[PDB]
Design a protein around this ligand. Structure first.
Ligand SMILES: *P(=O)(O)OCC(C)(C)[C@@H](O)C(=O)NCCC(=O)NCCS[C@@H](CS(=O)(=O)NC[C@H]1O[C@@H](n2cnc3c(N)ncnc32)[C@H](O)[C@@H]1O)[C@@H](N)CO
Lengths: 1238, 68
């Protein structure tokens, strides 16, 4: 009654080949007698109780005579296998031993033996065999039966109990406790995870003798080194180098019983004990062998301590202590029976967890090895390959015994050829710049659409005119070739134009994120020292403090003066400077040259060709280097680029409306944002928005394969995985994330793939040596696409840009990424070797945050930890949030709220911990290594009428019932991605439109309810502020000129659009009971816009009445070159149908806007009809332009005769009186108007 | 969990220079890569880096200096 779980059923089997004259019945009786002598062989288990039954009997072995068989040998093998394939019932009341005598020839015998693994092991069964043989020979000489040399089962448990209560038990237990305390984690030659206890008894055996004679030379050069310790050192270095690990836990075979007590024992003896191995790259082989020999020498004095006890005290798993296990022991199988040669063959030694490596140096000096591998984790040819690695491993030390363990090369000659093939990316590109490419493409297609947004639309010629103009302005402000220009601009056409102009003048652009605090921006500007800052008028008060900084406000187009390129840009000039978080001091800027980004864009244009039918989206903020291929790549292929709305990259719905609006064919996504985007998608929304997407790219994070298959099924649009740091000119490697290559991905992440043009990937180890496939190593980047370096920081540059040992004179960039290459040559991202994190695509150094937080007043130390605050907030993507843990130097409370608000003045918004927690003492554990699993998570009131639903939504998404208002959505576990779904939910639960940016700027119940529950409502509506002539649009019956918003796109970019309207509080439409008091009231605002010069006017409905009525009023004063009328009729045509028409105008005006105090609309329609019933018209001596809705009323005296007593030209489209102003009609009217205004 | 050598301050590096006079750090126990030469500085990591800080003044590559 000493056991609980029932032991396994695997057994140890073998057979002895006897070549000679054998008397089989006497040998069988000798088997029975020998088995009878040992009292431990008779043992059973009752269930559980493991105990010896002395009443068990043994039966004579079966004698099979296969000499008359067609294949005696193979049939004997089939017999022994037939017994071996069957599992052994452990609870049976019969002995667990089986012997069998097989005869394959007159003089040859196969003596099959099998035991349960709790009876004997690989060391102790030849004792039983040898005693049986001794009885056999003794009987063959006529002497009686020899006695039993085997120790009885009582004396061995007496001795073991002595050891259990001995003073050595506590000493050994303490020793192995200290050993497993400093024991490194296990390693494995198989990339697969370490399973622990294995069930498979079928293993792979491989015997290999090295006839190269290298080991004999290495051993004869190292005379004092014991050959066993030398071969063992070679094996340890071999394992560590193949796994790319200097510290790893292997296993070593010891013995629980020693001396005669081991030679007279039947039960298990061998004791596999944990062995920690530390490889030193500076040590020689004799030093490793010596230190390891002393290590084993210390371990041998405590080897009597059982290993299952080390597991017991520790234990729940699952991972075992050691994967591979090294065996230096030799088992003596030989036995001397007169005139017959005996050879013990092995059939079953039992399951192997991972890998057993046995080393046998012979007396001749050569070396043999025996490999026992798991058939599921390994295969034979790979074992041959690793054995070859060990072979050249030995040869190198044999040639040079002074070789360091760090300079040894374990890579085969063919793998160097593979790496030479994969990194052979040489493609000859021309010496050129971005400005030359853009100018070339513009020379190709001048009239093609290039740049566009909600207001402007430029062709390539117009765009190049604006770029050259702004470049000449920058040059007039003193921007010389080689300088830098900082940029703080909202997303519009003028951001793109700004960057192109900066490049055009031979300068580099420095994108600034206005969300950052002023201290960080001022630091950046002090480091970069730009010649000029391009911003808007409202952001200039922020930078009025910055010393020695010229500014410039660029919000409107300039007068075009030629499109010719300035030819000031050189390939050696810096193209863009992007600051990233530094792990040591202040943030560092990445200077990326022209030729690098030229290679990047030209490659992206070759590998992913774009045409004039393509439409590229501008979604990426300028502070991210991804945007670099959005600002330029479409302009080197003839494609079209379209600006998104500000902070629309955070709203998936806004991205849907944007894609659908412009018909985007090419865009980008961060895997987290991709998950948050497909979360908003239903198949019909996917076919209504994502139907135009032909190419989608993902970079910045490990790309999940499941997300890619989901995106493929929901859209079908080709997805591509790209990889690269900022210091490598955007992206370095590429890999298909759709279709066939996607279906073959076994891992959880899509590989980063193959290198781009003129770029090389090098996965080295800790010793700067290239690693074999499947092995993790540090990633390094080479080639033309590397950055020029860190701006003004030689130390960080020389630290991060190092020497390249495989490319003489060239440099090499240390990414800090851990990766490996697969069987197809594709590189797979695995992780990081530093504290750098990519949170939802954002590059964040934890060291910076730590330093800033421990720079706070009264802070002994502080630790940043990224973690999932609420596990119910993980719908896909990166749900991690930053949490700061502070301890006070005084022991006094820190007031974490003020400390966080103080952190907001130094660190970027996304680098500020959402939660700051104060701890009595920083939770260490063992050696003071800061246990991050001991770090506690942060715990998870008006609640008025409207915000109750907000609290309900919070409780829905966070899974935490929120009774208290004024609760931060982020501190409860929420993040950006979840805030998007929150915005959708509230948007369908509230009539008003809710955006995730409103959750960003105000994170609370009360604040969100406060905000939730543009240009202006004044007389002047600045639809588009240009420079040249101005087209005035008059308000319809609604009194608002909003509906002309979709006209500004079709007009020439130099034009201005100012709509006049009626702000009901003291507005012209209500203060006038005479419908000319308002036609003359608008002259007070129109003549104070442009007093002199010709006039260009446009009106709709009532606005058209107000158009002609002012037209003649100005013709009785300057001139009116253009007066457009949109289905406008004279007041002479209180009618019954016109009220239905006006009602349609009102209905369609307010129903086109889903959102109060806007009831003034309903007033301006009342005031409209009250004024419309009083007829007013003037013959209007001049001429005008008229657009007529064909599907309107009858009367063949239609405007041609109806407006005759008031020269005109008419255009006819099929629409109602309401649709004539709709965007669908402006798709034709717009071009007509512009062509008329030329 | 690699913990790269260049991130470790417990080891001693040395300053190496190419033909473009671009400076870099390199492990002392390793052979200086072809096309690179020692600038006369070794020892602790932060020490070598602080050396590079004052020695490396003109970030431009040598071949682009005469053209400037
Ligand atoms: P909330 O306020 O958190 O809102 C979340 C959203 C998504 C709205 C917000 O975070 C957002 O808009 N994010 C966009 C972030 C972004 O576009 N970042 C630039 C992408 S990375 C860039 C260079 S980098 O230095 O910044 N990052 C390099 C770094 O990233 C890892 N990496 C890149 N590519 C990888 C692949 N394919 N697999 C695995 N890891 C990858 C590397 O470790 C590398 O060191 C670009 N050069 C990337 O193309």
């Amino acid at each position: 009654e000493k056991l609980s779980e029932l032991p396994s059923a695997w057994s140890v089997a073998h057979y002895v080949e006897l070549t000679g004259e054998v008397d089989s019945p006497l040998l069988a009786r000798a088997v029975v007698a020998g088995l009878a002598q040992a009292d431990t062989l008779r043992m059973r288990f009752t269930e559980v109780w493991q105990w010896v039954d002395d009443a068990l009997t043994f039966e004579l072995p079966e004698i099979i005579d296969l000499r008359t068989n067609i294949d005696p040998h193979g049939t004997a093998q089939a017999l022994m296998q037939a017994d071996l394939q069957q599992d052994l019932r452990v609870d049976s009341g019969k002995p667990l031993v089986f012997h069998q005598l097989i005869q394959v020839a007159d003089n040859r015998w196969y003596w099959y033996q099998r035991y349960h693994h709790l009876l004997v092991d690989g060391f102790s069964f030849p004792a039983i065999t040898r005693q049986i043989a001794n009885i056999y020979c003794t009987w063959l000489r006529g002497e009686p039966t020899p006695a039993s040399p085997f120790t009885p089962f009582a004396d061995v448990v007496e001795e073991y109990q002595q050891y259990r209560e001995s003073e050595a038990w506590q000493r050994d237990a303490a020793f192995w406790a200290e050993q497993r305390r400093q024991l490194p984690p296990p390693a494995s030659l198989s990339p697969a995870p370490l399973p622990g206890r294995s069930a498979s008894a079928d293993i792979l055996r491989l015997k290999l003798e090295f006839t190269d004679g290298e080991f004999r030379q290495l051993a004869t050069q190292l005379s004092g080194v014991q050959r066993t310790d030398l071969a063992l050192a070679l094996a340890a270095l071999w394992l560590g180098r193949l796994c790319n690990r200097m510290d790893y836990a292997a296993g070593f075979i010891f013995m629980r019983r020693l001396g005669s007590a081991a030679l007279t024992a039947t039960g298990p003896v061998l004791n596999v004990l944990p062995l920690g191995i530390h490889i030193a790259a500076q040590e020689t082989l004799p030093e490793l062998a010596t230190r390891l020999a002393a290590q084993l020498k210390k371990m041998r004095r405590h080897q009597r301590y059982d290993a299952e006890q080390i597991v017991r005290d520790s234990a729940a798993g699952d991972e075992p202590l050691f994967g591979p296990v090294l065996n230096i022991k030799v088992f003596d199988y030989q036995l001397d029976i007169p005139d017959v040669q005996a050879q013990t063959h092995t059939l079953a030694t039992g399951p192997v967890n991972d890998l057993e490596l046995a080393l046998f140096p012979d007396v001749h000096g050569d070396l043999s090895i025996e490999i026992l591998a798991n058939k599921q984790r390994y295969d034979e040819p790979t074992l041959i390959q690793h054995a070859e690695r060990l072979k050249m491993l030995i040869a190198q030390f044999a040639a040079d015994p002074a070789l360091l363990c760090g300079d040894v090369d374990i890579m085969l000659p063919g793998e160097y050829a593979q790496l030479a093939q994969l990194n052979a990316t040489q493609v000859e590109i021309p010496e050129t710049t971005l400005s030359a490419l853009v100018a070339e493409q513009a020379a190709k297609t001048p009239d093609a659409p290039a740049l566009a947004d909600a207001r402007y639309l430029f062709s390539y010629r117009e765009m190049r005119e604006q770029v050259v103009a702004l470049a000449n302005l920058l040059r007039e402000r003193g921007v010389k070739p080689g300088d830098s220009v900082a940029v703080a601009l909202p997303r519009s056409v003028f951001l793109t134009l700004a960057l192109h102009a900066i490049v055009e003048a031979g300068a580099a652009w420095l994108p600034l994120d206005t969300g950052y605090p002023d201290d960080r921006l001022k630091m950046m500007l002090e480091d970069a020292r730009p010649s000029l800052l391009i911003t808007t008028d409202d952001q200039l008060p922020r930078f009025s403090d910055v010393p020695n900084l010229t500014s410039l406000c660029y919000n409107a187009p300039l007068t075009p003066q030629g499109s010719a390129p300035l030819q000031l840009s050189q390939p050696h000039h810096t193209a863009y400077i992007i600051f990233t978080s530094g792990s040591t001091g202040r943030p560092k800027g990445v200077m990326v040259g022209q030729t690098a980004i030229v290679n990047r864009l030209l490659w992206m244009q070759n590998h992913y060709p774009l045409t004039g039918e393509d439409v590229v989206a501008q979604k990426t903020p300028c502070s991210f280097d991804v945007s670099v291929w959005e600002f330029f790549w479409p302009f080197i292929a003839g494609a079209k680029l379209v600006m998104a709305e500000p902070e629309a990259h955070r709203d998936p719905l806004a991205m849907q409306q944007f894609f659908a609006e412009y018909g985007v064919t090419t865009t980008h996504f961060v895997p987290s944002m991709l998950a948050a985007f497909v979360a908003s998608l239903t198949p019909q929304t996917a076919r209504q928005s994502c139907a135009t997407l032909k190419q989608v790219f993902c970079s910045g994070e490990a790309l999940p394969a499941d997300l890619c298959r989901e995106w493929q099924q929901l859209t079908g649009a080709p997805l591509h995985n790209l990889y690269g740091p900022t210091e490598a000119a955007v992206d370095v490697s590429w890999y298909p994330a759709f279709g066939e290559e996607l279906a073959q991905v076994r891992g959880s992440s899509v590989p980063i793939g193959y290198p781009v043009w003129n770029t090389g990937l090098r996965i080295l180890d800790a010793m700067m040596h290239p690693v074999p496939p499947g092995v993790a190593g540090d990633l390094y980047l080479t080639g033309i696409q590397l950055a020029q370096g860190y701006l003004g920081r030689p130390d960080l540059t020389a630290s991060r840009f190092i020497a390249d040992p495989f490319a003489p004179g060239e440099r090499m960039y240390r990414t800090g990424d851990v990766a490996r290459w697969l069987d197809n040559g594709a590189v797979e991202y695995l992780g990081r070797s530093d504290d750098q994190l990519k949170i939802r695509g954002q590059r964040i150094e934890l060291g910076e945050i730590d330093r800033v937080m421990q720079a706070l007043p009264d802070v002994e130390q502080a630790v940043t930890h990224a973690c999932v605050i609420n596990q119910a907030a993980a719908t896909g993507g990166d749900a991690r949030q930053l949490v700061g843990y502070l301890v006070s130097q005084s022991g006094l409370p820190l007031d974490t709220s003020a400390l966080q608000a103080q952190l907001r003045e130094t660190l970027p918004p996304h680098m500020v911990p959402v939660v700051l927690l104060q701890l009595p003492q920083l939770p260490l554990s063992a050696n003071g290594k800061l246990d991050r699993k001991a770090l506690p998570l942060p715990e998870l009131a008006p609640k008025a009428g409207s915000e109750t639903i907000i609290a309900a939504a919070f409780s829905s998404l966070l899974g935490c019932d929120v009774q208290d208002a004024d609760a931060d959505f982020f501190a409860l576990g929420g993040h950006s991605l979840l805030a998007m779904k929150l915005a959708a939910q509230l948007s369908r639960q509230v009539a008003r439109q809710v955006t995730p940016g409103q959750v960003m700027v105000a994170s609370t119940v009360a604040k969100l309810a406060t905000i939730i529950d543009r240009m202006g409502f004044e007389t002047i509506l600045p639809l588009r502020e240009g420079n040249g002539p101005t087209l005035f649009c008059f308000h319809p019956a609604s009194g608002f000129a909003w509906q002309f918003s979709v006209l500004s796109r079709y007009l020439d970019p130099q034009w201005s659009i100012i709509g006049i309207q009626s702000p009901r509080p003291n507005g012209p439409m209500q203060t006038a009971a005479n419908l000319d008091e308002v036609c003359e009231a608008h002259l007070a605002t129109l003549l104070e816009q442009q007093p002199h010069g010709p006039y260009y006017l446009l009106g709709y409905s009532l606005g058209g009445t107000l158009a002609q009525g002012i037209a003649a009023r100005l013709r009785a004063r300057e001139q009116v070159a253009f007066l457009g009328l949109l289905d406008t009729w004279p007041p002479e045509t209180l009618d019954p149908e016109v009220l239905a028409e006006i009602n349609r105008e009102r209905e369609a005006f307010l129903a086109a806007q889903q959102g109060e105090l806007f009831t003034t609309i309903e007033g301006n329609y009342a005031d409209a009809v009250r004024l419309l019933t009083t007829a007013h018209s003037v013959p209007f001596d001049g001429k005008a332009t008229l657009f007529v809705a064909e599907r309107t009323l009858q009367e063949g005296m239609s405007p041609e005769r109806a407006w005759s007593p008031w020269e005109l030209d008419i255009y006819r489209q099929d629409c109602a009186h309401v649709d004539i102003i709709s965007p669908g009609t402006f798709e034709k009217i717009g071009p007509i108007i512009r062509a008329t205004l030329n | 969990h690699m913990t790269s050598v260049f991130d470790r301050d417990d080891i001693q590096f040395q300053v190496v220079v190419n033909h473009e006079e671009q400076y870099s750090i390199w492990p002392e126990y390793k052979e200086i890569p072809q096309g690179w030469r020692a600038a006369g500085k070794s020892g602790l990591k932060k020490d070598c880096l602080a050396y590079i800080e004052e020695v490396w003044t003109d970030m431009r590559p040598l071949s682009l200096r005469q053209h400037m």
